Design a protein around this ligand. Structure first.
Ligand code: SF4
Ligand code: SF4
Ligand code: FES
Ligand code: FES
Ligand SMILES: [Fe+3]
Ligand SMILES: [Fe+3]
Lengths: 633, 633
């Protein structure tokens, strides 16, 4: 089971699933082998009813699609649709939050409120919305209206792109036609241009994809901004992760999916229902996180993370998961059938994300508290049904320090330099104590032994003094292996990085260092890394493609991760992907994405499946940036 | 070559292409056989980087996707994405026109103007925009703003759905949650809900698809409305079709693609350049149509149609096509390589639709006339390059009577009953002279011998007194085989239908009948058929699912045709599709689309690849509706 996952708790539950005959994601993967090579390489098109069309990677016919579409066109169109799909998921997430904020300040959803007034005013200022002499509710109404306006064409471009990157970066992007006109406008344009008999030039198609990736960035940044207004900006917090956070004697409730509009209320309501849970024989309600919505409540409330991504089914195999509360994205639909075996009540809540065989409880922001109590009462009932049933919770957990929003990072640094908080970080990049920065992002993928790329790459980079930040299920992988526990700084970190983490921590009164990896939040919170990198660029007077900053989607899976990787390239970063995207069937497309895009945006993809080699390539990219700034490396 | 196309002119050019070694769409199809059965049946998913996933239609594993997605989910998600892609193509088309109208009345594009003031005021009235005491330019600005507003969420639903169907139909759709909130909003929601780990319930997915299909309907109806304002509402016109409309001694210029914003200006400018063409040794500029934009200029100006859809490459094989002017959609990208063999200058004009190897001339509405002259001068240069080169134009053409907008049909009927124009049509349905109405729509498809389904089905229905209307490349197929020539009424039409066509024609002063099939225009102009059917429903006080009206996408190909077929079902029509959509791998999905959707919308798909059988099934559907109204059949 070590071929399947490097997580020991997951290995234990894989053994239980095997002896119980419960099929898992790894079993479904094995049954799919060998996978179709046309799809793997990108050389398949089903964009019209003359297909399916395929192209042999090598050899004889077929060499071209029925309509004449070349390998270049087919590969680029498929990639563009993935970017648009990722942007759409983030469109749905951010748009949800914008509607929630609007309703809240219109008096239509009293369970929600302006929790971070400071962030509200700073967003309004960034967007040009006047605040002096205005009621907070009116400022927030204007912010929500501005958010919704960025989904369509108007007399301004998407402000959640143009106001969040430095002017010089916006100028480079505008010169290449890459600034999005509206989030849903670009998604639709992608679907149009990639439909049969439309765009058929690889460079033109890929430029469209870069522009749609910025629409995805806008949705991410909008999601983070709105969630911080509504639920609070994260600050440092200490919690735990892995399956050992489940408690046999409690009602265990997992929040899984994406949006804090749902998971944040579940957290607060669960506290008010503790007595009702005790009357049912439990110690209380133990809310635990899966995937991004788990990250959201971990960052803001210290809710412990149960598991992530590929291993999500294993939480159910323990026998102790009384409910799994879902909204949308990254939920394996197998959970609905596994629940019949394990006793778990799987509950969907969003109209556009149902699963056959799961119970559906419409969640309306307007009735959030009452909907949450209905959901949690189903969980309590389920806990009662397992009275006296043995459970197998692996007694395995790590300590996790998290909550490093960009505001929190700036505040931590300000303890070393109050009025120039970014300077201590830059000073230590210059003197070599920090070699550079690497953002780990994205998913696990069943093709890769779970977490193996993230931990292998992270270990090499940390020993070379790289400051490592992480989001999403990359943060999940690193947290579940101790990379967010400051007790592991000595073992993991190079001397220079240890010195800096220690200096910052001691200045924040910790008597100890910051953790080896800084958790910057959920996948939309990749936007927080953008805010940090843009702030550094602005402080230095250079563009992002001159900074020693890289990204790694080391085990990528979802269309959202392709979108994120593409905007990382578009804003100027060397961006590693540790699984093969469906591009290898076209050398011209691969050459654009890994090489000639450098001349457009300064960023580029690094496709590398071997993690030791990927680490060397990321270090080379960092050191090339250092040399470009005239620094030793 | 009779296995390839039933069009004799196409057969002749296929022989020429063969002896010249020029590969065609039919050759590329042969090279693709056998096509992938997983894709054919819909049992393939590439929505994340764990794939490609496939499911065996029958037998052993794989039985389920890696994430747990069932065959039902995989099939429904693939279908939904096709609907969204079709809606997007129509979003791009209608949105283009909305921006053109706005610019025109803001003084930013003087080549464009309000040509149909009557239609402008009637659209404004339908939308609730006040006209009394208002300048036309201001009414048009408000109409264009309303069009653009329907792309996103607002305090009203999509008005180009809710104001174009009868209230009772809107009520049925609203009761099932099917009214779209915004055109691009629904496209994005589809891409979100079908992404990995989101919607995983076939019924829920398919309801989303029906709603997105209404977003497609809105884009179609918006496109027709705006094009009629800008370029005039069609009225009856007489022209010709097939390759014999090319003229060896003229500069032959094909307009190909979709939007009249481009093709309409080319038509007018070409007239002003006749002398400049004569100086180059030509008789003039002979503009001819391919595909929908050809239909647009045929309907409004009587421009002859050269060819359509699958046989588009054959226009170039003649050696006489000096230019092919493209905008977007349904253009085989092979045209760019064939042009090097044939001498044709292929010219793209839209930023989001380029083809490697073609010349690109940006077309800006703001400079339309100057851009058109640049394009036409490239064509003149090309004509000069072929001085003394022999050409092979098949001397094959048909006579085509067309221009039957819904306004024109109502006007024709009003000659029999001035103040109740629909009543003569209803009277003849009741007395059996008209059995029912069938709309032929959509593409040719290389899998089907070109035109064979359209003509086989049409012949049977016409002999059974069905009133036949047609759009797009269904109109193209029927026109190229004489179905729009009134001289063929005696041969093709049953006695009752002949009587009605004759009575209407004689009342319109023709001394002869209307043609056997009424050409209602381009693919967006399927919306004209909706207007006619809705007007009949309103006049009768019944919903559309009680009327003896059916549709047939007899040779469907494009994602747009899937979208159209789906909204035909959603508005209440029995809808035949003559090629297999990728649904057969899920019996539950097939059963919803062909049977249980009847209980939701009253419409349903009829999947039938044998055209004689399809005709019998369409007649049965018509006659079942007649029986439901208490009529003999
Ligand atoms: S769009 Fe072209 S390559 Fe794709 S399925 Fe249709 S004919 Fe084949
Ligand atoms: S979404 Fe599910 S079925 Fe589709 S490729 Fe990914 S794992 Fe396979
Ligand atoms: S041929 Fe396998 S993905 Fe299409
Ligand atoms: S396996 Fe052939 S279409 Fe995917
Ligand atoms: Fe996520
Ligand atoms: Fe068309």
């Amino acid at each position: 089971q070590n071929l399947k996952s490097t997580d020991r708790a997951v290995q234990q539950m894989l053994d239980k699933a095997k002896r119980e005959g419960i099929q898992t994601v790894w079993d479904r993967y094995e049954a799919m082998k060998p996978q179709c090579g046309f799809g793997e390489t990108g050389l398949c098109c089903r964009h019209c009813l003359q297909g399916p069309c395929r192209i042999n990677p090598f050899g004889d016919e077929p060499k071209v699609g029925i309509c004449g579409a070349t390998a270049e066109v087919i590969v680029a169109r498929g990639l563009d649709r993935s970017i648009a799909a990722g942007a759409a998921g983030h469109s749905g997430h951010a748009k949800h939050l914008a509607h929630t904020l609007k309703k809240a300040v219109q008096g239509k959803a009293a369970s929600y409120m302006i929790k971070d007034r400071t962030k509200l005013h700073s967003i309004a200022k960034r967007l040009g919305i006047p605040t002096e002499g205005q009621k907070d509710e009116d400022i927030a109404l204007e912010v929500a209206k501005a958010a919704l306006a960025d989904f369509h064409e108007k007399d301004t471009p998407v402000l959640w792109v143009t106001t969040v990157l430095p002017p010089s970066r916006v100028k480079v992007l505008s010169a290449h036609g890459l600034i999005p006109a509206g989030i849903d406008h670009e998604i639709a344009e992608i679907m149009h241009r990639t439909s049969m008999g439309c765009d058929a030039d690889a460079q033109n198609l890929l430029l469209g994809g870069l522009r749609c990736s910025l629409a995805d960035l806008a949705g991410c940044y909008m999601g983070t901004d709105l969630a911080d207004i509504l639920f609070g900006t994260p600050a440092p917090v200490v919690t735990e992760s892995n399956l050992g956070v489940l408690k046999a004697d409690a009602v265990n409730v997992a929040v899984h999916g994406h949006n804090p509009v749902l998971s944040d209320i579940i957290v607060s309501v669960s506290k008010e229902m503790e007595n009702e849970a005790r009357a049912a024989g439990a110690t209380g309600i133990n809310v635990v996180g899966i995937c991004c919505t788990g990250n959201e409540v971990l960052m803001r409330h210290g809710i412990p993370a149960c598991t992530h991504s590929v291993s999500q089914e294993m939480a159910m195999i323990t026998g102790a998961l009384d409910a799994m509360i879902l909204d949308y994205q990254c939920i394996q639909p197998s959970v609905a059938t596994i629940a019949e075996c394990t006793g778990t009540t799987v509950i969907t809540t969003m109209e556009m994300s149902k699963i056959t065989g799961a119970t559906h409880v419409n969640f309306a922001e307007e009735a959030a508290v009452e909907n949450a109590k209905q959901i949690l009462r189903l969980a309590i009932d389920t806990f009662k049904r397992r009275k006296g049933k043995p459970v197998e919770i692996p007694n395995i957990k790590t300590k996790v320090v998290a909550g490093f929003s960009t505001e929190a990072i700036i505040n931590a640094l300000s303890k070393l330099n109050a009025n120039d908080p970014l300077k201590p970080l830059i000073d230590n990049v210059v003197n070599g104590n920090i070699r550079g920065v690497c953002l780990f992002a994205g998913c696990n993928n069943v093709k890769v032994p779970q977490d193996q790329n993230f931990t292998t790459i992270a270990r090499k980079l940390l020993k070379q003094n790289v400051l490592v930040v992480a989001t999403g299920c990359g943060a999940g992988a690193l947290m579940r292996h101790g990379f967010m526990d400051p007790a592991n700084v000595d073992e993991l970190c190079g001397d220079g990085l240890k010195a800096v983490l220690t200096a910052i921590g001691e200045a924040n009164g910790l008597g100890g260092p910051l953790p080896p990896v800084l958790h910057m939040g959920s996948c939309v919170d990749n936007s927080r890394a953008v805010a940090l990198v843009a702030a550094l660029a602005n402080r230095l007077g250079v563009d992002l493609d001159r900074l020693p900053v890289v990204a790694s989607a080391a085990e990528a899976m979802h269309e959202k991760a392709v979108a994120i990787g593409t905007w990382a390239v578009t804003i100027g970063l060397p961006t590693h992907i540790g699984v093969l995207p469906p591009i290898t069937g076209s050398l011209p497309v691969t050459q654009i994405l890994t090489s000639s895009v450098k001349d457009i945006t300064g960023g580029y993809f690094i496709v590398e499946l071997d993690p030791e080699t990927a680490a060397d390539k990321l270090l080379a990219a960092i050191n090339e940036r250092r040399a470009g700034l005239g620094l030793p490396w």
